[PDB]
Design a protein around this ligand. Structure first.
Ligand SMILES: Nc1ncnc2c1ncn2[C@@H]1O[C@H](COP(=O)(O)OP(=O)(O)O)[C@@H](O)[C@H]1O
Ligand SMILES: Nc1ncnc2c1ncn2[C@@H]1O[C@H](COP(=O)(O)OP(=O)(O)O)[C@@H](O)[C@H]1O
Ligand SMILES: [K+]
Ligand SMILES: [K+]
Ligand SMILES: [K+]
Ligand SMILES: [K+]
Ligand SMILES: [Mn+2]
Ligand SMILES: [Mn+2]
Ligand SMILES: [Mn+2]
Ligand SMILES: [Mn+2]
Lengths: 321, 321
């Protein structure tokens, strides 16, 4: 995927010059959101879709949370440049205009928007059964960040504290692996540790807007990272310095996936493994950061940034990424 | 589709209050773009995808212009609130990370961005063969319009001149009907007026940014409408006043579709029928508007706004929509 994407990324970089010295002049591609110069502030812009989680939703008939997944993944990405999320449009590409599906989808859209503090301001609905084998839900969000307040990881230095905020579960990455591995053997009604498999696979992605906005207005913050596609590898987008981490015990849906033969080094590159969002702060801020975040969600001191470069060492699992 | 979508639009309107009195406060849903209050200016935001035209692109191994379609449809919608397009992100949902396809897509992304004057600032690439039977390309664009300079149709008055700007061809609406009607009967290589059927179906959507921005900065403009899904019915989004129009001769792919039994009232509700964009100006501006638009594309007087509220009368075809 990265190799195919290189030609699109290189072309996109060549279009930056079209806004050079004008409103909308962008920063570089590669971070969690694009930053556009509006003079007194930057507009942040990001887009993402739910993914094949929606095939599980359709299989069992539970659609009232995929709209939470859509809103969560987009607003969480805005947070990772330091931005306040403001507004979103949704792109809904569907096999058919099933009114019941749309009614359920709208319930989760409302819940997620209310939790994130964003208005849903427009969208697109495309009925395309030749192209879409389900109900593909995506969106684009915009946020605002003041000049001088952008947080992209540039200030991360060896010694900094690395703190994890718990995920609600699988969130919206790794669903293809989980679906193909687990559904044929167990079925979606299989009970694992008190929850059916569809409950594990459809648990809505957590929204981190309130804790992160409180955090960045309270302490010095050097980096912010949503743990999405690529798992812990997302940390390498913030910095070339290394990480030395102790990750939480493997539990819930991740434990079942591991027990069905996925090695841990692969799982840390695919799944969030219990940590949905990671923040990097100077050590003197660690205690206050943990206090703030813990009032919202279970949060952990994971480890330290290191002078050793380019590696993520998960010490308690013997893994290096 | 309208009934299913009402569930989502009802919920979206309920989220507007989350930005009441704050940066990002939106206007209402229903126009070609969302307008968000940023104090001194509105941000305009819209999203749309190419559609099943990509299945023709795939068959002939030519994705070189699909990026033009995606950019055109998004920047043209921004024009219809009076906004200058600035930046876009693309959402590329693919059955495989095919490096040939991606290299082709990048070519048209550059050409479309350069013609529209926008930067491509980010995106999402989702490899999802279980969900996507092809390569679906969509995007989201943002633009800017100053307070006092929004053009959404409220100033349209009876007697105003209605001017059409020619389309390049089918653009990106009505492709499923055209594909299902023509491809299994004629074959993709069927030659019609010197072009193969696939060339008719794949012709990239026209970009109207340069003529429309020159127009709005030179003459009084009362309404702007891209002729996309719904065909001429899009005009009713601008005003409750009526329209009396003479539409161009039915030519090219539209003639072939018509000769295969689609009724003309349906075709004016599905296809652009040769008119890709419509502008509404006071009569005294008509000649100056035609001169400005005709620098860039074939453009012509279509008719006038009337007091026959809610009717679109295509006089020369005897069709009332
Ligand atoms: N899934 C959706 N969610 C929210 N708003 C939508 C959705 N689909 C369409 N809309 C809104 O409905 C209006 C009509 O949309 P559409 O039919 O896609 O036409 P257009 O692309 O010409 O705006 C627009 O204001 C659009 O923002
Ligand atoms: N199709 C695309 N076009 C332009 N930029 C893209 C595209 N896909 C991904 N990107 C950019 O590459 C970077 C990584 O994207 P992605 O892998 O989706 O992770 P994330 O969602 O965590 O940003 C982002 O900056 C994104 O904007
Ligand atoms: K992103
Ligand atoms: K990612
Ligand atoms: K639109
Ligand atoms: K439309
Ligand atoms: Mn993301
Ligand atoms: Mn649309
Ligand atoms: Mn549109
Ligand atoms: Mn992404």
């Amino acid at each position: 995927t990265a190799r195919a994407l290189r030609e699109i990324i290189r072309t996109a970089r060549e279009t930056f010059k079209l806004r050079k010295g004008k409103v909308g002049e962008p920063g570089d591609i590669g971070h969690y959101a694009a930053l556009l110069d509006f003079g007194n502030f930057y507009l942040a812009m990001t887009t993402d879709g739910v993914g094949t989680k929606v095939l599980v939703a359709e299989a069992v008939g539970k659609f009232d949370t995929i709209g939470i997944d859509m809103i969560a993944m987009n607003v969480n990405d805005l947070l990772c440049v330091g931005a306040e999320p403001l507004a979103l449009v949704d792109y809904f590409a569907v096999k058919e205009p099933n009114e019941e599906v749309f009614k359920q989808v709208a319930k989760g859209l409302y819940k997620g928007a209310e939790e994130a503090g964003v208005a849903i301001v427009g969208g697109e609905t495309a009925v395309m059964p030749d192209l879409i084998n389900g109900y593909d839900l995506a969106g684009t969000a915009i946020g605002i960040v003041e000049k001088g307040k952008v947080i992209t990881g540039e200030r991360i230095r060896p010694g900094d504290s690395v703190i994890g905020i718990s995920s609600s579960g699988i969130h919206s990455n790794g669903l293809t692996l989980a679906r193909k591995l687990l559904i044929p053997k167990y079925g979606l009604d299989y009970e694992y540790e008190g929850r059916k498999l569809w409950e594990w696979l459809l648990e809505p992605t957590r929204i981190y807007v309130r804790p992160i906005l409180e955090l960045i207005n309270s302490v010095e913050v050097h980096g912010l990272a949503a743990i999405t596609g690529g798992g812990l590898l997302n940390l390498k987008r913030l910095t070339n310095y290394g990480f030395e981490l102790e990750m939480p015990p493997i539990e819930g849906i991740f434990k079942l996936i591991h027990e069905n033969g996925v090695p841990l080094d692969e799982m840390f590159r695919v799944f969030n493994m219990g940590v949905g969002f990671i923040v990097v702060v100077p050590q003197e801020e660690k205690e206050e950061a943990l206090e703030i975040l813990s009032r919202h969600y279970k949060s952990y001191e994971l480890g330290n940034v290191t002078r050793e470069l380019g590696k993520i060492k998960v010490k308690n699992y013997g893994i290096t990424l």
